Amino acid sequence: TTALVCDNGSGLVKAGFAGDDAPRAVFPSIVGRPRHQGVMVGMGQKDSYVGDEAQSKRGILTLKYPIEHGIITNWDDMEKIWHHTFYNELRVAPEEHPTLLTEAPLNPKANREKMTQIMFETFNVPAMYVAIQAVLSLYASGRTTGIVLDSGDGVTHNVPIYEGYALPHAIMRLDLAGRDLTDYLMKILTERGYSFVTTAEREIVRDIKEKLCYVALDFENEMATAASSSSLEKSYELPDGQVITIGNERFRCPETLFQPSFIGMESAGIHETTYNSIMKCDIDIRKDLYANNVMSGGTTMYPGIADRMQKEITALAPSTMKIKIIAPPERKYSVWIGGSILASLSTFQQMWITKQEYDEAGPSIVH
Amino acid sequence: TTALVCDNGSGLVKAGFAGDDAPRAVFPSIVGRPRHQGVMVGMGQKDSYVGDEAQSKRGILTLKYPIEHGIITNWDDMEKIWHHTFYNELRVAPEEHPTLLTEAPLNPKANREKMTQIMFETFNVPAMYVAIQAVLSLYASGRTTGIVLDSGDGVTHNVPIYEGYALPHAIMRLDLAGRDLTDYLMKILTERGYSFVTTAEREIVRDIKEKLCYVALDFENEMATAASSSSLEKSYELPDGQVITIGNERFRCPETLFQPSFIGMESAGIHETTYNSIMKCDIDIRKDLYANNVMSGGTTMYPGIADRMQKEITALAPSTMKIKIIAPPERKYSVWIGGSILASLSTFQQMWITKQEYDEAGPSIVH
Amino acid sequence: TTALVCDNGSGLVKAGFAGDDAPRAVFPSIVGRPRHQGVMVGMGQKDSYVGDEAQSKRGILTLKYPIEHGIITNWDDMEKIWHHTFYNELRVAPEEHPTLLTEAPLNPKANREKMTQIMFETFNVPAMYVAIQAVLSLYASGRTTGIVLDSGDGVTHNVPIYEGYALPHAIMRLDLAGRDLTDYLMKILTERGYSFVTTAEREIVRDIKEKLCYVALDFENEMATAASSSSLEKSYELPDGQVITIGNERFRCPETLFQPSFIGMESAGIHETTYNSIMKCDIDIRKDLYANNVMSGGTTMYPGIADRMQKEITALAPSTMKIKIIAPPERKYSVWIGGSILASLSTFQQMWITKQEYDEAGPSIVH
Numbered sequence A, B, C: 001t002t003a004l005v006c007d008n009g010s011g012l013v014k015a016g017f018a019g020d021d022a023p024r025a026v027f028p029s030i031v032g033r034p035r036h037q038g039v040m041v042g043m044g045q046k047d048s049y050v051g052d053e054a055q056s057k058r059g060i061l062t063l064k065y066p067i068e069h070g071i072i073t074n075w076d077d078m079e080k081i082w083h084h085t086f087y088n089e090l091r092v093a094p095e096e097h098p099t100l101l102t103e104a105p106l107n108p109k110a111n112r113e114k115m116t117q118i119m120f121e122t123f124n125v126p127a128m129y130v131a132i133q134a135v136l137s138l139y140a141s142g143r144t145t146g147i148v149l150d151s152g153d154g155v156t157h158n159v160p161i162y163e164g165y166a167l168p169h170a171i172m173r174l175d176l177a178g179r180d181l182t183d184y185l186m187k188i189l190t191e192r193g194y195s196f197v198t199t200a201e202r203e204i205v206r207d208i209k210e211k212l213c214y215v216a217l218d219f220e221n222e223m224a225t226a227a228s229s230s231s232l233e234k235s236y237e238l239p240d241g242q243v244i245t246i247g248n249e250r251f252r253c254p255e256t257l258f259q260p261s262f263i264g265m266e267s268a269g270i271h272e273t274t275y276n277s278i279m280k281c282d283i284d285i286r287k288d289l290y291a292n293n294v295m296s297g298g299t300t301m302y303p304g305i306a307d308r309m310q311k312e313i314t315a316l317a318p319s320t321m322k323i324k325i326i327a328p329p330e331r332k333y334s335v336w337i338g339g340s341i342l343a344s345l346s347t348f349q350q351m352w353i354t355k356q357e358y359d360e361a362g363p364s365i366v367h
């Protein structure tokens, strides 16, 4: 038997057996109950559709993401994600695979207890471990030192690791992006008359967030050049047929990551949380936090980064210091490519939670 | 085969086989425990890093000097200093080499016994001799008479030696230099906002004690030119982005050597310990103590000495007596260049402690 | 006419004329600009609200404390604190009152000069003196000898005074508390799902630092009884209606005072800085510093000290030495009750800085 690396995405849950390429299965985590009367009565209709079927039945359901602010909203829907995934996606037996699960560095307890407990008693996995997503993005990177910027929809993190230790008093969590970037994009699409009201229509917003957004090099000059009559304007096509023309707002929405006041978030931007996390680390270690600034996750893949991120950090940081922004190929699968390396090496198999230990100590005192 | 001269520095431990030019190994003596949580778990991280690597891995460790106020603070770290030095620096086996160790003339007994005993019983050397650090600097100096200064971070001593034997009742111990100069520099750089709070950051202070400091010719008039618009400000560069500009305090810290009331030490300065040790020596011998004054150790290498020390001694000394304060080139290796000359010469090699005599007498009668 | 004692709070600026019972005005020192679009247009909204009214107008502003790590961060807002205090609280003319101002024992210069200079040239005070806060707590103490532990949010100090002299070679400053205690409390309330990321709610964290915290007598046994189902849990009420139930973390947070490791600070605890400052003083003068251990400042108000503080000092100190921990009622006003006694005394009113001296000597020779 082989171990299974399953990343508890907040998107965009990722699943695949131990190594070597990229996750076997990726899906948007949606469950949706039917919001219009069934009186056609074929019948044959499912009580709750999961993805991908919840993306081929839009407008007849009400899509509900089961993870909200990085917290499992109800484990009733979450367990159904898991069951659906193991049985009708991956097609593997629970009692036959040691698993690897992920979490967020700054998150409430007993959220990991209740998780660990429900998966051991419901699915009876033969072994389990729960890793923070940032440490796996360090393993994925393959650098041995650096400050990790792990940004997925929608919990970001700033974790500093230096060969091979970490500082407790340094992690910063912003709930800045990205589901709020979806809502903000929906609020500034009203500026060109596009009103997307329903849950289903929110997916269309997400599709323009995927394909057509970019980030500016300099805010003031992109705002200036938007005022020019020259066509920044991009023509999107709608699944119903319609042609949607977006301009200014196309670079405005991601720019929020360099200015949270515009989305109504008081705290300082990714720009400043990077600097302020570096200046919570000791004198010697700062030298190598500069030039081991490592980004990760799907929401760091916008076209205007990393050279925006580069120019902005390089301006605020102390003069004459070597600053390079490490941005891997295919950051969306970074965490998973991390997890594969971890569970395949010796000896951290003997840092896995196992059934004998669970029988003795249950959800209590896991470390 | 060849005998080994290993000088028990208080700094800055010095090691090299017998003959002729300079020590083969010099290192900051630091042992450092791991102070942060080891979340990477690669791992390969050793239980404790010694120097030199504990000076390239600062902030991930907490440096604890193993010799404190001139006494070995714990032999658990000290034995590891020795073992690390013999095996992974010099690259030799102790059963193959007679060793030569150093001590201080005004230190506790039986801490020289316990040293001698632990190295004979732990490392199994075939022969040993223990010299006080001042006497070896006389052989290095090549003089037949004079007062000897071993001044290191943090115990100095002042020993008068005549032709061909020493004067028992004239030895003076000042605890004034040099770790108290390190700590005083760390307290008076805070007055210009350079608040070096942590243990690790204290090493950076020590590095500014090497390069930037100097000594005055007259305190009152150097204090005058600090008040002047003229630059006494020298700008140092740090491993972090930070350019530090110190002025007055740059010459203020070493001046403590001629005024221990600055560091709140009640003892009289180098000025007075020179004079008062000479005026505890006999009238006839004083004639040849003047103009046979030998400085040694790393903390006598500051720029503004020795003609400050000279001018101060010439002011207190009797009228019409010729006084030249002659201190060698390359003082940092002085003690060691002593030890090489001693252990290579006939005949007192056959007055060394040897394995059978150690078996017979143990730590008893080591004087 | 009458002299005015105005204490330059780290919190918590305190003001009242010479004598008797307590300061007449106490306030949290915050300035806050409005972080929202002002499109209601009443109008009448001030450019920035100072305290205390800015603590009844939270959330519609972004509160910024003017003193950060024991230094005044920008003197424009500091000057506005002063201007607001004299004019819109006290209602006294600066040209009519000789004042008394405070500072921290170990702080960079020209921080007291630049302050003194700005207050003389901007507000045109007729006479002034600047006292360090620990010395003023000596008059409040009512003992003429002893070691002063002055801890306010966030500068602690350890000053030894012996009838009626001060030992300069022994003052210890820990930057251990208290804004970092607020921040640590905000970070360990996330463990029970209570997260308070934005500025206004951070005040509420400070309020829970008052009310529900207590110092443990035995850490290991309080952690044990926390593991038990016994009601260590206290129910707080939150301004929007929420009921917050905190347990463990209530006694964990203040315990940081004896374990700097909790906040990740390298430095030694109050436990050890008390002992290590005493063992930097002269032999005959700590036997009278034991039992004249005098606490001060608002961050020593917690229940659970002083008999924790007592047991901890008594455990590290040598046997057969009498120990007593002097902790006044109302330590929050200690500094001020000091200042009142000072400004009433003859003759050292004529050792205050007068305008004639300032006209002649300016910002030089202040100390």
Ligand SMILES: Nc1ncnc2c1ncn2[C@@H]1O[C@H](COP(=O)(O)OP(=O)(O)O)[C@@H](O)[C@H]1O
Pocket (backbone or CB within 6 Å): A008, A009, A010, A011, A012, A013, A151, A152, A153, A154, A155, A178, A206, A209, A210, A211, A213, A297, A298, A299, A301, A302, A303, A331, A332, A335
């Ligand atoms: N090319 C792209 N440009 C911008 N955003 C993208 C792109 N591709 C995916 N995303 C966003 O990234 C999110 C997925 O991030 P992910 O790395 O899965 O986070 P997590 O792993 O925490 O769930 C999606 O919600 C999507 O909105």
Ligand SMILES: Nc1ncnc2c1ncn2[C@@H]1O[C@H](COP(=O)(O)OP(=O)(O)O)[C@@H](O)[C@H]1O
Pocket (backbone or CB within 6 Å): B008, B009, B010, B011, B012, B013, B150, B151, B152, B153, B178, B206, B209, B210, B211, B296, B297, B298, B299, B300, B301, B302, B303, B331, B332, B335
């Ligand atoms: N150029 C320099 N100027 C001033 N001090 C120095 C210089 N070089 C070394 N030192 C000091 O001298 C010390 C080393 O002295 P050393 O002769 O090794 O004493 P010991 O042999 O007793 O250990 C170091 O702690 C360092 O602070």
Ligand SMILES: Nc1ncnc2c1ncn2[C@@H]1O[C@H](COP(=O)(O)OP(=O)(O)O)[C@@H](O)[C@H]1O
Pocket (backbone or CB within 6 Å): C008, C009, C010, C011, C012, C013, C151, C152, C153, C154, C155, C178, C206, C209, C210, C211, C297, C298, C299, C300, C301, C302, C303, C331, C332, C335
């Ligand atoms: N009952 C209490 N328990 C614990 N902490 C308190 C209590 N009352 C006040 N404090 C803390 O003490 C601080 C005020 O201390 P203070 O003596 O004003 O310091 P300073 O005078 O240096 O400003 C506040 O920041 C508050 O957090």
Ligand SMILES: [Mg+2]
Pocket (backbone or CB within 6 Å): A009, A010, A133, A151, A152, A153, A155
């Ligand atoms: Mg994530």
Ligand SMILES: [Mg+2]
Pocket (backbone or CB within 6 Å): B009, B010, B133, B150, B151, B152, B155, B297
């Ligand atoms: Mg020495």
Ligand SMILES: [Mg+2]
Pocket (backbone or CB within 6 Å): C009, C010, C133, C151, C152, C155
């Ligand atoms: Mg204070």
